[PDB]
Structure formats: C-alpha cells, structure tokens
Amino acid sequence: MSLYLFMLFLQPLSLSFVSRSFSKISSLMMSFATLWSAVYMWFTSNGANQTFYQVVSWGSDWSTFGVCYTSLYISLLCAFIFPICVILVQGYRALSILICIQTAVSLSIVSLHMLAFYALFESSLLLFFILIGRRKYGSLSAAYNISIYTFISALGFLISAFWLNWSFGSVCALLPNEEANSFVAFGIFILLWVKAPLVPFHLWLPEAHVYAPTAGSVLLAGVLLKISIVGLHVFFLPICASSIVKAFPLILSICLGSFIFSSFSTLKQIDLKKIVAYSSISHMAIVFLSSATNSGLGIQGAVLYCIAHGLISPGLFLLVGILYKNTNTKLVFYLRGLSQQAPVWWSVWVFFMLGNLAFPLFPNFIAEVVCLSALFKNHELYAYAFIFFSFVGTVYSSTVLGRLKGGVSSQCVDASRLDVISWNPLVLATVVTGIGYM
Amino acid sequence: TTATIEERRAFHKEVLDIVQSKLANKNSEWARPEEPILHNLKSEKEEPHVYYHNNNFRVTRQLIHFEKTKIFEDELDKCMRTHGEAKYRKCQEIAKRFQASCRVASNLERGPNARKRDVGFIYQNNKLRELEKDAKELGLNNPFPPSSPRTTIGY
Amino acid sequence: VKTLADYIHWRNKPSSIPPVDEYRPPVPLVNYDKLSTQFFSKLDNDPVINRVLRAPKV
Amino acid sequence: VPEPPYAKYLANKSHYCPPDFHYSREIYAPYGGYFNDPKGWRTNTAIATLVMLAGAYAVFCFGNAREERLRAPKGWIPSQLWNDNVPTPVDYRGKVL
Amino acid sequence: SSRIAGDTTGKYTPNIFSPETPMDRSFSHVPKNPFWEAWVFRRDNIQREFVWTWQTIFDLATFVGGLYVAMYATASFCSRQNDKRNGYPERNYYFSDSKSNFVIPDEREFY
Amino acid sequence: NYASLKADTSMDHVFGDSTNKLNYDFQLMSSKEAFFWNYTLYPIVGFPIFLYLYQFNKLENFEAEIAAAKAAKAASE
Amino acid sequence: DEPKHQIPGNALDNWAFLRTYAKPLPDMIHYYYYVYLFGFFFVYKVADFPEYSPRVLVMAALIGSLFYVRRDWVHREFKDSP
Amino acid sequence: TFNYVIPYGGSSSYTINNEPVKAEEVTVDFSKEPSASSLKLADKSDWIAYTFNNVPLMATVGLLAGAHEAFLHYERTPIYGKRTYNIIKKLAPIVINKTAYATLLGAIFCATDALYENYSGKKSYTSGMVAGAATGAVFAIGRPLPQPLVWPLVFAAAPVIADLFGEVYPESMKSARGYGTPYGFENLDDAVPTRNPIRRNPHHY
Amino acid sequence: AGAGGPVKLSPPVDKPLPYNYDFWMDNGIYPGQPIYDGMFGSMVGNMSLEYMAKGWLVLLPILSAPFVYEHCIADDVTRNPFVPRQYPSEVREFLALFKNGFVLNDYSQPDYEEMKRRQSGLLTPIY
Amino acid sequence: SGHPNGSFWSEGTQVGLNGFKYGEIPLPNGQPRKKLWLENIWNIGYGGFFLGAFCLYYGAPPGHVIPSQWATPKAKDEYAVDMKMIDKYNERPDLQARLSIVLKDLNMIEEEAYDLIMMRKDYKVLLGLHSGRVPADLKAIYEELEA
Numbered sequence A: 001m002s003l004y005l006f007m008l009f010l011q012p013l014s015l016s017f018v019s020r021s022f023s024k025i026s027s028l029m030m031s032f033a034t035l036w037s038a039v040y041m042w043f044t045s046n047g048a049n050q051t052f053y054q055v056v057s058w059g060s061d062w063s064t065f066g067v068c069y070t071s072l073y074i075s076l077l078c079a080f081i082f083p084i085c086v087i088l089v090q091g092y093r094a095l096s097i098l099i100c101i102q103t104a105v106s107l108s109i110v111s112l113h114m115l116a117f118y119a120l121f122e123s124s125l126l127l128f129f130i131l132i133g134r135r136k137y138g139s140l141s142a143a144y145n146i147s148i149y150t151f152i153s154a155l156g157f158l159i160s161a162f163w164l165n166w167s168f169g170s171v172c173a174l175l176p177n178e179e180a181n182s183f184v185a186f187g188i189f190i191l192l193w194v195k196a197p198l199v200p201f202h203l204w205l206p207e208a209h210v211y212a213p214t215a216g217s218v219l220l221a222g223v224l225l226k227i228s229i230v231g232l233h234v235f236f237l238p239i240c241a242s243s244i245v246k247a248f249p250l251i252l253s254i255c256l257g258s259f260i261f262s263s264f265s266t267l268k269q270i271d272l273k274k275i276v277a278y279s280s281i282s283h284m285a286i287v288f289l290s291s292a293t294n295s296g297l298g299i300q301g302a303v304l305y306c307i308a309h310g311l312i313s314p315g316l317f318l319l320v321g322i323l324y325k326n327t328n329t330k331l332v333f334y335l336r337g338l339s340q341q342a343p344v345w346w347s348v349w350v351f352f353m354l355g356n357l358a359f360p361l362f363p364n365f366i367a368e369v370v371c372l373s374a375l376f377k378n379h380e381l382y383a384y385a386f387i388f389f390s391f392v393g394t395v396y397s398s399t400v401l402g403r404l405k406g407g408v409s410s411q412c413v414d415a416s417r418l419d420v421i422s423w424n425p426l427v428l429a430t431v432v433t434g435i436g437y438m
Numbered sequence B: 001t002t003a004t005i006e007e008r009r010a011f012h013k014e015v016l017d018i019v020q021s022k023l024a025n026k027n028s029e030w031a032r033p034e035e036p037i038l039h040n041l042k043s044e045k046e047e048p049h050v051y052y053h054n055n056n057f058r059v060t061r062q063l064i065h066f067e068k069t070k071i072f073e074d075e076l077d078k079c080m081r082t083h084g085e086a087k088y089r090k091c092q093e094i095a096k097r098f099q100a101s102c103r104v105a106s107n108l109e110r111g112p113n114a115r116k117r118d119v120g121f122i123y124q125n126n127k128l129r130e131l132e133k134d135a136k137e138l139g140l141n142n143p144f145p146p147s148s149p150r151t152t153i154g155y
Numbered sequence C: 001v002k003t004l005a006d007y008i009h010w011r012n013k014p015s016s017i018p019p020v021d022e023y024r025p026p027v028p029l030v031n032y033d034k035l036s037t038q039f040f041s042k043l044d045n046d047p048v049i050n051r052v053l054r055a056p057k058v
Numbered sequence D: 001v002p003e004p005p006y007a008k009y010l011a012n013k014s015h016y017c018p019p020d021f022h023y024s025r026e027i028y029a030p031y032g033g034y035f036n037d038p039k040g041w042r043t044n045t046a047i048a049t050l051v052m053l054a055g056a057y058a059v060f061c062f063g064n065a066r067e068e069r070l071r072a073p074k075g076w077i078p079s080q081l082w083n084d085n086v087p088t089p090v091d092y093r094g095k096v097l
Numbered sequence E: 001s002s003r004i005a006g007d008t009t010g011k012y013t014p015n016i017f018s019p020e021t022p023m024d025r026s027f028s029h030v031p032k033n034p035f036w037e038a039w040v041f042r043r044d045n046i047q048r049e050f051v052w053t054w055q056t057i058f059d060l061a062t063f064v065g066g067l068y069v070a071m072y073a074t075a076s077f078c079s080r081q082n083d084k085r086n087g088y089p090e091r092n093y094y095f096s097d098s099k100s101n102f103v104i105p106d107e108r109e110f111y
Numbered sequence F: 001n002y003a004s005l006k007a008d009t010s011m012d013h014v015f016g017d018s019t020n021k022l023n024y025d026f027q028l029m030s031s032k033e034a035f036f037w038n039y040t041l042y043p044i045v046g047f048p049i050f051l052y053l054y055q056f057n058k059l060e061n062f063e064a065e066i067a068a069a070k071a072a073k074a075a076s077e
Numbered sequence G: 001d002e003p004k005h006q007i008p009g010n011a012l013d014n015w016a017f018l019r020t021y022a023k024p025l026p027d028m029i030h031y032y033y034y035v036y037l038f039g040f041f042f043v044y045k046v047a048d049f050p051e052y053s054p055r056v057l058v059m060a061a062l063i064g065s066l067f068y069v070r071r072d073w074v075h076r077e078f079k080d081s082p
Numbered sequence H: 001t002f003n004y005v006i007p008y009g010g011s012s013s014y015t016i017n018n019e020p021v022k023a024e025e026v027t028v029d030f031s032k033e034p035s036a037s038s039l040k041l042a043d044k045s046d047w048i049a050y051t052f053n054n055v056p057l058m059a060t061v062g063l064l065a066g067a068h069e070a071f072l073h074y075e076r077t078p079i080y081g082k083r084t085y086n087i088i089k090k091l092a093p094i095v096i097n098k099t100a101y102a103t104l105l106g107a108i109f110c111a112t113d114a115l116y117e118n119y120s121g122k123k124s125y126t127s128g129m130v131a132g133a134a135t136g137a138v139f140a141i142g143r144p145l146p147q148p149l150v151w152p153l154v155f156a157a158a159p160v161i162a163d164l165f166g167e168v169y170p171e172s173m174k175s176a177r178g179y180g181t182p183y184g185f186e187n188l189d190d191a192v193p194t195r196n197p198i199r200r201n202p203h204h205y
Numbered sequence I: 001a002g003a004g005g006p007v008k009l010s011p012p013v014d015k016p017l018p019y020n021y022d023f024w025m026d027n028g029i030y031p032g033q034p035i036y037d038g039m040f041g042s043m044v045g046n047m048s049l050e051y052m053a054k055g056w057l058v059l060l061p062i063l064s065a066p067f068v069y070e071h072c073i074a075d076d077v078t079r080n081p082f083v084p085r086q087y088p089s090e091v092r093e094f095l096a097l098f099k100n101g102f103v104l105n106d107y108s109q110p111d112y113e114e115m116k117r118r119q120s121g122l123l124t125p126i127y
Numbered sequence J: 001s002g003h004p005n006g007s008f009w010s011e012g013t014q015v016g017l018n019g020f021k022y023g024e025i026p027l028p029n030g031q032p033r034k035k036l037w038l039e040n041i042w043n044i045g046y047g048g049f050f051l052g053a054f055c056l057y058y059g060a061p062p063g064h065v066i067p068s069q070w071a072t073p074k075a076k077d078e079y080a081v082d083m084k085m086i087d088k089y090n091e092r093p094d095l096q097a098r099l100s101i102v103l104k105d106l107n108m109i110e111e112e113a114y115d116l117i118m119m120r121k122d123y124k125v126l127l128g129l130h131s132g133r134v135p136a137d138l139k140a141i142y143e144e145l146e147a
C-alpha cells in the first residue's frame, strides 16, 4: 500500500526532473513501476483480513487510505491500463496532463475519506476541460458538458459529506455511521447518477469520448466510469442503505430506462466512437442495479462486470483510434472492405465486439451471468427485463460489423507493429479473464 | 425491551475490555472469528468493535456454507451417477440435504430486498397445503393445485 | 405585459430547413410493380391467363 | 504500372489461383493468403501433425486421470485396456463378469 | 511519384523537399464526399430542426413517459409480491403512504 | 482532395443503367400507427409480467375470500 | 469548403435589427441613484413586514423573475411616442 | 462491510427502543418561536382571508417590476426636447398593468391552494402543485404551443421546491446537533456538554 | 468462375442525402438493398401486407380445425377408446407426479381429480 | 487445373512472402530490423505483471488470495457432524416433535427442519438464543444430537 502510494506520487514528480526528451521513456517506466507496485500491494493483501486488506494513515483522517475488494480490482485495472494510454500520447503537455489525471484518479480509488475522495477525484476537472477542448481536435461543447455535469454532481456530494461530517463528527468510511435522511442520500446519489452515466444525465459522456484523444477515451471508459462503483460500495451503501431500499422501485425504473433508451440511441449512431460510448452507457445500468440490490451476488457481480468492461471497452476504443489514424474517418459509411483490407485489425475488432456482446469465452459472460443471478434473486421479472432487451445491442453491433465487413475499398489500412503491441496485453487479459481467472 | 443509557455505557466498557483482551495476544485468525460477540444492542453500529467482529464472523460462516453446499452437490452427483435408474428412490435423502444446504446459504444473507430462495418448492408446497386445508374446512373451492408429495428430486 | 415568455427563444420553427432536392439511391428496375391488395381476384382466372398458361398442351 | 521495388520480395501467384483473379499480394493474413501453397508446406504439415499427436498424448493422460466411471459397464469396454478404474462389468441379469 | 518514408533500419528521415510524394500514413486516407460530409453535419446538428409540435409531445410522452410508468408499476408490483413472499410488513417506500416504519429487515429477527 | 462525383459507365451495358431510382420517401411510421404498435408489441414482450399479475391477483383474491369465510365461521361459533 | 449552420433571415434585415440597439445611451448613475435610495428605504421597511409562508415567498420570487425586463429589452424597443 | 459476501449497511431492531437522553443538562434556545402574525397569515381556513393577507407580497413585487420598467422608459425620454405627449399617461399603464397581473396571478395561486387544502382536508404537496398548475394555465392563456406545457410545470414545481426545502428539510434534520455525541450514538465516549453552545443571540432586526 | 467475376460499382452520391439514409445498405456494388428487405421499395412477388393477411385469414381456420376439436370439443373419456397405460402401484404413483406425464388422464383411477388439478398447475412460482 | 505437377505431395508453387507482416519490407541483405524503443520495456513490464499474477494465484498459501480455499477443510468437518446429526434426527421421532414446536415459534415451516439443524452455529441462532427470540428448547435438542 505504501509502495503503491509512493510510486503514485513519484510519477507526476518524475516529469518535473526529466530532460524533456526522455519524457516518454521515463513515463512508460514509471507506469510499469506503478503496475509492479500494484502487484506488490496485491501480494501484501492477505485474504485473512476480511474487512480491509490494508489501511494506512499519514497523520489525519483525510490521509487515510485503504484497499478492499472493489478498491483492489479498480486499482489493478487502472495500473494495468495506464501504460497503453501513455504510449498512445505524444508531447510533454499531453503527458503532464495525463499523468496528473491518472495520479488523481488512482489516489481517489484508495481514499477512505469522503472529503479526501472529493478532493482527489475533482482535482482532474480543468485538466479534462483542457484535454477535451484541445486546439484542433477538441470540442469546447464537450468540455463544458463534462465539466458542468461533474461540478454539479460533486458539489451535491460535497454538501452531503459536509452534513455527515457535522452530524456524526467524522466522514471516514472506517467509522460505522448510518443515516436515514433522504436529502443526504440524494446528495451522495446524484454524483453516482451523473458519473456512471444514467438516463437522463448521460449526455456529457459521448461528447467527451468523441472529442477526447485515444489515450483520454481509453482512460475514461476503462476506469473513470468505474469510480462510481467505488463511491457506491465505499461511500453510499454503508451509510445510505435504507434510502436505496426505500427507493428501489425508482432506482430500478431509472436503471432499466437508461439501459433501454441508451440501447435505442445506439441504433441511430454513425460514428464508431459514439457507438462505443453508448454501449458503455447501456452496460453501466446492469452494474448499478446489481450493486443497489445490496446482496453478495450483486456486489461481486457488479465489480466483476466492471472489470470486464474495463478490459473490453479500452480495446474497442484503441482499435477505433488505430483505424482513425490509418484513415482519418470514424464514419461507418466511409469504412468498407475492412475484412479484406485489414485481416489483422478485423480479427481483433471482431473478437472485441464478440466480447462486448457477452459471449461465453469472454469475461462479460461470467459477469453478466452473476449480475442476472443477483437480479433474479431480487425478482424474476427484474432479470427477464434485462435479458430480453439485450437483443438491441446485437442489432446495432451486427449492423456495424456488416457495414464494415464487406464492400469495395482501394486502401490497405492495417495495423502496424506498434498497434499490435498496444493491444496484445488487452487481448491476453481478456482471454485469461474469459477462461475464469477473474 | 428498552436499553437505558447506563446499561449502554456499561456494555461499551465491557466491549472495550474484550478488545483489550484480544489485543494482548497476536492472532493471525483475528478476522476469522469462530464465535460472535453476544449483544442486545438495538443497532449493531453503536458498538463499532462488535459490528466489525460480528461481520467477520458472518463472512466466515457464509464461506463455510458455500463450501459445504459444494460438498453436498458432489455427493449428490456421485450418488446419482452410481445408482442409474434407481436414482429417484435412493437419492431422495442426499438431494434433500443438498437443497437444505442451498437454502441455508442463500437465505442467511440474502439482503434487504432479496426474496427467500425456495429451493425444492417447500414454501410453495406449504402454502398450497394451507390453502387446501382452509378451502376444505370452509367448504370453499380451491382454484390452485393440491399439494404434491414430491415436487423435485428431493423436496 | 412584457414577460420573459416574449423574449425566450422558443423552439416553434425550425432554424435549419433541409434541402428540398434529395438523393434517391439507384435501384434495379421492375417493369410492372403495382401491389396486389386482393387475395381473391378475377385476374387469376382471367381468360388470357387460361389460354396462355392453363390451356396449352404440355 | 512499374511494379514497386518491394514486389520482388513478395510471392508469385499460386497454381490454384485463377489467372484472371487479381489480388493485392502485400496484405498479410494469419490464416494465409488468397491461394497459399507455400514452399516448405510438407515440413510445416509434418510439424503440425507431431504437435497434434503430442497434444493428443497430453489430453489422453489428463482425461484418463479425470475419467470417473461410477457405474459398472454392462459388458467389456475398450477403456479397460488403458484405464484401470473401470468397475468390473455386470450384465443385465446381474451376474458379475 | 511515390517513395517509401519508413525505414526499418532506423535511418528514417522526412524528405520534406522531395519532388516525389512520401508514402506516409496520409497515403491510405479515404477520400471524403461533399454530400456525405453535409449529411454527417446535419445528423449531428439535428437539434436545429427540433420543433415543439403536438405530434412530438404525443410521441415523447407515449413512449418515454409510457415506458417509465410501466416500469415503475412493474417494480412496485414486484416489491409488493416480494414483501408478501418474505412475510415482511408492508415497507415504507418513498411515494407509498404507509402507516408502517418498516424498511430494512432485522437480520437477527425471524420473519 | 474530395473523391470524384463522376460515375463509371463501363458496366452500364452489361448490368443495366442507374437511371431508375428508389421510390421511398425516407420517412418513418406515422405517430398514430406507432402508438398502436408500441402499445401492442410491448405487452406481448412482457408476457411474464401479465402471468405474474394474473396469478398474484388470483392468490390474493382467494386468500381474502378464505379470510372472509373464516371470520364468518368464527363469529357465530 | 465545409458544412456550416444555416442562418435564418436575410443579411440586411438582421443587420437592420441589430442596428436598433444603436441609440443614445443613458448613464447608469441615474438608475443606480434611485435603486440605492429606494433599496435603503426598502431594507428599513422589510424589517417590519409580516412573516410570509415559504411557498408564498417562492411564488413571489418566480413572479418577479418572470416580470423582470432586461435593460437591453427596453433599450431596443423604446420609442419616443405617445 | 467492505466485503463481497454479506449485504452492506446494517439492521436495527424494531422491538428494542433506546430511551431518549438529553443532549445537555441545561438547554438554552436562541431560536425564537413563530410569531402570531406568521400563524395568522399561514391560516388557510377562510380562503378569502388567506388570499387577502398574502396578496400584499405579489402586489409589492408587481409594483417593483412596474417601477423598474417605467423608470427605464422615463430615463430614455429627453428632458431637453419638449414632448407633445404626457409622460405619466404613457408610463402609468406600465406600472398599473404589471401590478394588476402580478396580483391576479398571486390571488389565483393563493385561492386555489386554500380551496384545495380545505376540500381535501389535508396539507399536501398536491395542493401546491394544483395551485401552481392553475396559475401557469392562466399565465399561458394565449401563448404559443410550448408555453402551455412549460408554465403549468414550472409554476407547479415552485411550491414543490418551497415545501421540500422550506418545511420538510428543517423538520427532517431537527435532531442533529454537531456538538457532544452524535444524535443516534450516545454510548460512544465523547465529551458531554453541560449547556448547549450559544453561537448567537436571538435576532431582533 | 467463382472468383474474379465482374461487378458494377454503385454511383457516387451526387445529391443531398435524406436524413434517414442509414436505412439503405450500400457496400459500393451497384445493387444496394434496404436494411430489411420489404421495408420499402419493390416487394417480392408484388404482394402487399394486406394480401398476406387475407391469405392467412383464409388459411388459419382450415389449419386450426383439427386442433380445436380434440383439445376443446373432445374430453378425456371420449378422446381415445382405451385408458392410459396401466402400471404397478409403485410405478404409477411416481409417474403421476410428473405434470407433463401421460398417466394423469386415467379417468378409471380414483385419483383422477387430484391428477387433473396437478396437470393444470401453477402459472408462476408462488415463492 | 488439378495439382501443380499432378501430385498432391509436391513442393509448393509459391516462393517468397505471402504478405508483409505489419507492413514491414524485408531488408535486402537479411539485416535484422531495428527493434522499437518500447519493445523491451513493454515485454518486461507486462511479462512481469502476468508472471507475478500467476505466482500469486498458485504459489500463495490457501486463504491468502482465494478465501474459499481456507474454508474447505472446515466445511468437511461440519459436513460430517451435520450428516451424523441428520441421521440421528431421522431415527428419533420424539426430537422431531420438539423441533416442530421450535420451528413454529420461529415462523418457519416444517420442511425447514434440516435447515435449523444446519444453522447451529450462525449469527441468527446464536444471538437469538442469547436474546430470547429463539426458544431455549433448541439448545437441549442440539445437545441431544451431540451439538
């Protein structure tokens, strides 16, 4: 734990002292060192400590950090996926912004103080405004959307944290507190409602992903959406369980509506990135509902599905980025003959799309099975609703694949050595998780 | 049942003593307790030490239940595979025990919103028995099937 | 009475009007394309059809 | 159009390729090209067959260790020659063999 | 008219002054279409042609509100059935007006 | 720059001209028709919901009738 | 050339509409003096007002927001006529 | 719980109750109780009386808006040039009409609120929603298409917002103290106060 | 020749595109097709939906006539000239348990009423 | 048509590269391609991750990484006790009558008899007996069946 936190603080620090020409090499080595430190944290985490594997405090309640099941999986996912983002990004400015965003996100996951959690997650607010609104390839609209949505949700969460700190006297997760207040529950909930895109607060995500760089999109879908599940498991369910049980019919309505409307909206998309973004929104609904059931099957299923998404969505966003670099287009209508012209890109694309559809040899299948079982534990109709509407994902994915698969094309647009190197870890991880090493 | 503040503070002091006794000798199995800390608190959250210890005991128990269920399933599958076509008569008991284990594991910590897992349709069969008894004694006509001897391989 | 309602830009009329002339994709030509909406018709037992199809010795 | 310099490195059209059919020879596919027939195929196929037999041996070992027969066969089964965990056959009447 | 930009040996240099066009990553870009580009622009900027008409209100209310109402009604029914199944007293839900305070079942208690 | 908008007429003799165009107006179903088909198809999709509602109603009605009769028998006696 | 948003209206008509804002501009001191004076007297009077229900207060705030006219709106439409 | 095996949160016994214990030995309250005026105005028993008590607020807001607009018109008019028309004749309709419309809308809102509460017999959110909806319907009598839907919604929402954050919020969070021991958890060993903190004297302005 | 056959290339778009052009599937070969055949454009055989419905209306009664008789008009006693297969008591009791069994229709049995109520079982799980 | 020399088992007719893998052109003299800057770092870091994950999953003692592995021996012991106890329960009809009484007070059906036997050492039963919710008869019944 201490090694992981130290490496996390060293990665932004290293950039200040690098030669400005060695920046990319140093950043890659630091990312790998952070991954190795995360593996060490996993090694030093004994299952015998059932509640929290490790807790460290550095002199205050704010500096209380600790790892649990959700935290451990998300932290390992962030450390696994960061090297890919690093190699995909060029320039000191871009590296600095990305490394600061990563440090803030990775510190947020392990934080056990609500106020510290807020301080670390929302520090990366201007950096995303600047990243999504970059000079030539960025959109100011998307930056404004994401920034305003984040500020409003996090401010509500902050108000709830202030009330809990005033009333109980502490806001640390390790101190058992329960609250029946509905205003405070709503304040904590609104952050989760926005961060994990749920209809009608999902509009910020697609704009940000489309106008973000591939490293940014990969980080966003891979781990930024997951930060909601850490807040739910660590900062919402322990204190506001009563309000989740009181509002379960409403929670279920909003989650199922998000899943349905997002699936239908994905059908009208002509941009590959927008298709992947709306697929993520649809997938987040099952995770949110499963965790809200407050059952063992649901919490485990939600975390597992989150890992599966955090392994499948970065792959699709990476392949889309590679294709866009080769062709300078994201319109499905312009891209044809990709099967014949890019047999190697096509194979990986088909594999990842099969993963997104929750086929058996993919992590998504196991995760979905567990989440559906949790819903069936609640009610049979709850499970049936989700299972039936899954066909809509098939229709859009099939239509996209069919449009891309065949036609006439005069351009050989296949992946280079660098592109295969970038996806190989993701492919291997997907396969390993698919075979049951979740 | 009412709890006076004097009794609550007394229990708090006793809990602190229990923590101090646990702290005196190192234990690698501290978070895998074999016995719960008995209490009459309205809310377990009041005493944090009791809450965490009892939660760890509950997790230990549930893990044990899950492994027991897996063992029961293995004996049922072996029994079914050995007997052949006599499986229905000879494997009724093993199946009954396996289904009981499944119910215990699932029902103990189902959650606030989860329904009871009716492995073996025992609850449905019971409900149908009550409905039949009432209809017959009151002279009503039951619109539901009568209770069944066996509804599953075991229960 | 002047009110916000007067100066709010209500979405009552389209800001952008789609171009009237629109692309129709090329399609193979079917010479006769009138849809048959009547399951039972005199056309099926027409005298012409009987002479052309039913009657000739095969 | 004057073929590019790299075209010397690329392979020719195979015997099975129809003469009219034109394909780009630069494209790489893991499953092979349009008509394949590489030189050295006979050796590659022999290596493949050897890897197949070795994997079959490993699979056979694994299966034999994990094949659990809990009910006696009605008559003699081929598994007896290779696996020793077969219960002694009992016939329909019930007589042991 | 074309030349190989990439050098495997590592002695890659961009001949910015070469008469012949380098076969760089830009060689494989797909040619855009004036009409397709305008279609893409129209599709993305479809908020401009949005108009509040009775048909639009009808369609929105009937499908979006209608689905939301159906989903709420189903969830409420399932909650009522589960409460009856579990044997728990009628739970105090948010919009339900119940003169009962029951919300979370007691784990110690036997229902 | 942009792709050529000029078509190829090499195969026009072999495979036919492109003069014939589609007759579709590229517009979707009417709002009135859509309301009927959504409110018809969606109930068909939710067949389990109606089965559960039916059985639950039957069970509750039977239970209430049983209670009523029980009360009646427990009053006189 | 790139696809661009269609601008409703003719160029000269829109420019003419924009030119109706080019009118003699009063100094803001005149408005401020009155607002300061009446605001001071209003604050003194507010202490004596009866306590109103929160619902009534919110409704009054809504009505005031709806009935407030922006200074630019009067400026554009002002005509020195009967 | 922070584990994947058991449900998070906890359960509290419904049978077992904890006897209330005073926050402090002596309680000094710096918060004054509602005035007799507040209760009189809040009384909705007689709709006409309720309406006439609460309209002064709407009339004042209408007068402020009309004075604002009238001043804006007056400021632009030139003193140096003689004007044929009478300025007061031009300006008086502005103020009068604004005040009348504001008073009418507030009267509709107060009347409908009181009448619904009397007929229903219960204080509820619906009374505010129906009063707002009726006011918004009167506001949008001749307005184009979107406004008839939007104004009844905005107006109905406003009493909902007022009820949630003006009445329900404070009563819901009355118990929380912030000093001594947490409201629910008095067993915990936290410093116990003899007297409550008095951060300010009761106001008098 | 399976491979290398001539194809006609679809003409490049030269007019403003309709908003719902995503309903057309064009790979670059000349005959493009709707996303779902028959959604618009030429219909196979020149047969409208109304024609198909009228056909199904003519056909449905003739097809349903055999099934309606036995299922509804006929009864267990009159459906067949024999009783269901007779089994020893131990076998019969077990076989009667199966809801989807064939021994539940034995009117001769004194447990017919119970068996018939078992066959018409619960629509959904009670718990 | 047919095979190239009329024999299926003849050398392939294609000499050269079927395609260019990754788009790289073979060096004329057979010079190896220069390795990319990231290849060594990428291979070391990711291989180290996967190898560490493998070693942790398999090398670690039972109950360190997978908690269920620790519970397996204990479950076997409780299974043995439960099996013996259930066998005793089936034989003695006096105990069955007492449990039928205990079950009713606990709002449990008769079929849940085996379930009660299997929850002898669980939060609900242990704390209910202490508090008074569970009838004290259960303790004696459990002792009669060797706990």
Ligand SMILES: CCCCCCCCCCCCCCCCCC(=O)OC[C@H](COP(=O)([O-])OCC(O)COP(=O)([O-])OC[C@@H](COC(=O)CCCCCCCCCCCCCCCCC)OC(=O)CCCCCCCCCCCCCCCCC)OC(=O)CCCCCCCCCCCCCCCCC
Pocket (backbone or CB within 6 Å): A012, A013, A015, A016, A092, A093, A096, A097, A100, A101, A103, A104, A119, A120, A123, A124, A125, A126, A127, A130
């Ligand atoms: C003891 C033994 C020695 C061992 C060493 C141990 C010492 C420990 C620490 C010492 C390390 C040196 C500290 C660095 C100081 C200068 C850093 C800097 O200028 O950043 C850019 C600078 C790059 O310089 P440059 O490329 O040459 O051009 C910059 C030009 O000057 C101007 O270029 P421009 O005009 O084009 O601006 C473009 C701008 C685009 O415009 C923007 O985006 C503006 C956005 C506003 C700020 C960003 C908001 C979000 C920032 C979040 C914080 C990041 C960490 C996240 C972790 C969460 C923490 C809660 O983009 C950027 O500048 C970079 C984007 C991301 C960097 C933002 C992070 C810097 C935050 C504040 C810097 C500190 C200045 C203090 C000033 C001191 C006296 C003046 O440095 C970096 O390499 C990246 C930032 C490194 C961050 C570490 C600094 C700590 C801040 C974290 C706060 C935690 C509290 C502090 C405690 C720290 C430990 C005790």
Ligand SMILES: CCCCCCCCCCCCCCCCCC(=O)OC[C@H](COP(=O)([O-])OCC(O)COP(=O)([O-])OC[C@@H](COC(=O)CCCCCCCCCCCCCCCCC)OC(=O)CCCCCCCCCCCCCCCCC)OC(=O)CCCCCCCCCCCCCCCCC
Pocket (backbone or CB within 6 Å): C004, C008, G034, G035, G038, G039, G042, G057, G058, G060, G061, G062, G064, G065, G066, G068, G069, G070, G071, G072, H061, H064, H065, H067, H068, H071, H150, H154
């Ligand atoms: C004879 C002298 C003439 C003066 C007459 C009286 C003299 C003053 C005597 C006493 C003055 C004290 C009290 C008067 C009000 C206090 C304001 C003040 O004095 O500041 C100095 C102010 C000038 O200061 P400035 O800094 O130079 O100008 C800044 C502006 O940018 C100015 O630039 P601008 O005008 O070009 O820009 C205006 C901008 C400025 O923005 C504001 O006005 C902000 C005010 C917002 C609310 C204010 C707080 C409300 C709390 C009231 C507290 C009491 C209730 C308690 C609980 C309520 C909870 C909220 O707002 C707008 O854009 C127009 C919209 C109007 C409000 C926007 C909110 C709309 C929400 C409604 C939703 C419905 C739409 C749905 C459909 C939409 C479709 C998507 O002088 C005045 O305006 C006084 C005129 C008196 C008319 C007020 C009308 C009603 C008064 C009470 C109602 C409370 C709401 C306030 C509404 C408007 C007030 C400005």
Ligand SMILES: CCCCCCCCCCCCCCCCCCCC(=O)O[C@H](COC(=O)CCCCCCCCCCCCCC)COP(=O)(O)OCCN
Pocket (backbone or CB within 6 Å): A141, A144, A145, A148, A149, A152, A190, A201, H161
């Ligand atoms: C007691 C109080 C009673 C109630 C009174 C309410 C009165 C108003 C309350 C509204 C507060 C919401 C604040 C957001 C305002 C909408 C955003 C401003 C619109 C806008 O044009 O922003 C542009 C881009 O924003 C964007 O692109 C953002 C798009 C829209 C953001 C969505 C809002 C976040 C989600 C909303 C609610 C979520 C949960 C709510 C609990 C930037 O404009 P510019 O820089 O060019 O400036 C030039 C001047 N025109």
Ligand SMILES: CCCCCCCCCCCCCCCCCCCC(=O)O[C@H](COC(=O)CCCCCCCCCCCCCC)COP(=O)(O)OCCN
Pocket (backbone or CB within 6 Å): A156, A159, A160, A163, A182, A183, A184, A185, A186, A187, A188, A189, A243, A244, A247, A250, A251, A254, E093, E094, E095, E096, E097, H164, H168
């Ligand atoms: C219309 C559908 C509702 C949309 C929400 C759908 C799903 C959201 C569920 C979130 C889960 C936990 C949140 C707890 C309650 C939030 C909404 C529950 C529904 C609700 O509004 O119930 C109200 C009570 O809640 C309250 O009193 C609080 C309402 C929320 C306050 C709104 C903004 C608060 C922001 C505060 C920021 C932080 C403050 C911290 C001090 C009134 O229901 P009722 O019980 O009176 O029944 C009387 C009816 N006959």
Ligand SMILES: CCCCCCCCCCCCCCCCCCCC(=O)O[C@H](COC(=O)CCCCCCCCCCCCCC)COP(=O)(O)OCCN
Pocket (backbone or CB within 6 Å): A381, A385, E061, E062, E065, E066, E067, E069, E070, E071, E073, E074, E076, E077, F042, F043, F045, F046, F049, F053
């Ligand atoms: C302006 C915005 C809105 C304007 C337009 C709204 C128009 C929509 C109105 C109808 C929408 C669907 C109907 C659902 C509500 C019907 C009436 C609600 C009252 C109600 O709860 O009755 C229950 C309806 O059955 C049920 O439990 C639900 C049956 C219908 C659900 C399945 C139908 C479609 C399935 C598609 C999937 C959606 C659900 C997926 C899980 C059965 O009465 P009760 O026994 O519960 O007694 C409870 C005491 N009233």
Ligand SMILES: CCCCCCCCCCCCCCCCCCCC(=O)O[C@H](COC(=O)CCCCCCCCCCCCCC)COP(=O)(O)OCCN
Pocket (backbone or CB within 6 Å): E095, H120, H122, H124, H125, H126, H127, H153, H154, H156, H157, H160, H164
């Ligand atoms: C920020 C809250 C503002 C509401 C936003 C809703 C959307 C705005 C559209 C305007 C519509 C006007 C406002 C209606 C919202 C109230 C919900 C209607 C439910 C309802 O009618 O039940 C009432 C109680 O609900 C209630 O009145 C309490 C429910 C609290 C409202 C919902 C709280 C969470 C909503 C936040 C969602 C997302 C935030 C972004 C805006 C009746 O109750 P009763 O006691 O009268 O029983 C009857 C005995 N006569």
